[PDB]
Amino acid sequence: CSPGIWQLDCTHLEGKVILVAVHVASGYIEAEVIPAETGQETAYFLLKLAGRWPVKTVHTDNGSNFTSTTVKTACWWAGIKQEFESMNKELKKIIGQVRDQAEHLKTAVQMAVFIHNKKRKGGGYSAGERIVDIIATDIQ
Amino acid sequence: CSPGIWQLDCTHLEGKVILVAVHVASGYIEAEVIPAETGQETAYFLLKLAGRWPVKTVHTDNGSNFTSTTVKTACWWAGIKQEFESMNKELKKIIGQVRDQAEHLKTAVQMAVFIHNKKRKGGGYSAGERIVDIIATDIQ
Numbered sequence: 001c002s003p004g005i006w007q008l009d010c011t012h013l014e015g016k017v018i019l020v021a022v023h024v025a026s027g028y029i030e031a032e033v034i035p036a037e038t039g040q041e042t043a044y045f046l047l048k049l050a051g052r053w054p055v056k057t058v059h060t061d062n063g064s065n066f067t068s069t070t071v072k073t074a075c076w077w078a079g080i081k082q083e084f085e086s087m088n089k090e091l092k093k094i095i096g097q098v099r100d101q102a103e104h105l106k107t108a109v110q111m112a113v114f115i116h117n118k119k120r121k122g123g124g125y126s127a128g129e130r131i132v133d134i135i136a137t138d139i140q
Numbered sequence: 141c142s143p144g145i146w147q148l149d150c151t152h153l154e155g156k157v158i159l160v161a162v163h164v165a166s167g168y169i170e171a172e173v174i175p176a177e178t179g180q181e182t183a184y185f186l187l188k189l190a191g192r193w194p195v196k197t198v199h200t201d202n203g204s205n206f207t208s209t210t211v212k213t214a215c216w217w218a219g220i221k222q223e224f225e226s227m228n229k230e231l232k233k234i235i236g237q238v239r240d241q242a243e244h245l246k247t248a249v250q251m252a253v254f255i256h257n258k259k260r261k262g263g264g265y266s267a268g269e270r271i272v273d274i275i276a277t278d279i280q
């Protein structure tokens with residue numbers, strides 16, 4: 001599985017929208033609570049993600065997510081292409097587990113991302129260790 | 141220079157606040173436009189950063205930035221310690237250069253972060269390549 005492949009989806013919780021990007025080869029996650037499922041939020045999230053990792057292609061489970069000119073302009077600019085688990089259920093589990101530790105869901109979501117990315121898998125490395133290892137190896 | 145060291149500061153542009161985190165050993169940047177310079181925004185940004193990279197210690201040029209219980213609770217939770225260029229001027233340059241390409245400053249800022257992190261330095265690697273190389277080497 002290519003190191004440049006990400007999957008991006010939205011989930012709903014507490015009337016709010018959680019955008020979840022998963023680095024496919026590693027299981028590493030970035031996520032953000034957005035006010036609305038909009039082309040503009042998606043484009044913005046893509047720019048942010050691409051500035052941080054070498055994002056080559058993005059997949060989704062809802063293709064209509066990527067049809068706005070706003071989104072296609074963000075991929076154009078960042079040089080991203082499209083195509084055309086669930087680690088989303090596990091993230092939601094974690095969120096429920098830490099939910100009480102924070103007032104705002106947005107805070108709980110970042111706690112859950114932290115926990116997911118740092119958890120030793122294979123009982124081995126964490127997803128946070130695997131992404132860095134995968135991308136460095138691909139560089140050299 | 142230890143791989144776990146980050147510097148975090150706020151700048152002002154267009155009446156808005158830009159929080160800038162710099163990975164010291166590599167020059168890699170993460171940044172975000174926040175509505176207000178608040179303990180809560182800083183804590184939230186720290187949680188997000190720590191979920192993504194192995195953040196051990198954070199430095200700042202304004203120590204009072206880190207005195208709220210809100211912020212100290214985020215470091216406590218994420219296991220971050222404190223202490224007690226400018227690549228901020230260069231980021232501001234980039235921002236001015238792409239400013240016209242976007243309506244919202246927040247969008248321009250992410251474009252500038254992208255450009256900064258992908259630029260081949262030493263004419264060599266980009267900051268995005270160096271951080272991954274530094275952190276992977278430190279893992280193995």
Ligand SMILES: CO[C@H](C(=O)O)c1c(C)nc2ccc(Br)cc2c1-c1ccc(Cl)cc1
Pocket residue numbers: 101102103104105107108180181183184209210211213214217
């Ligand atoms: C960053 O937003 C937090 C939240 O959504 O609950 C928040 C907020 C909004 N207010 C706080 C006030 C005092 C203290 Br002590 C901690 C917080 C916290 C807080 C909650 C959990 C952590 Cl790990 C760090 C800070």
Ligand SMILES: CO[C@H](C(=O)O)c1c(C)nc2ccc(Br)cc2c1-c1ccc(Cl)cc1
Pocket residue numbers: 040041043044069070071073074077241242243244245247248
């Ligand atoms: C994401 O927020 C953008 C901005 O701050 O200017 C935005 C916004 C807010 N609206 C757009 C509407 C149509 C088209 Br085409 C592009 C955009 C864009 C846009 C601007 C630049 C890029 Cl690279 C991608 C999208």
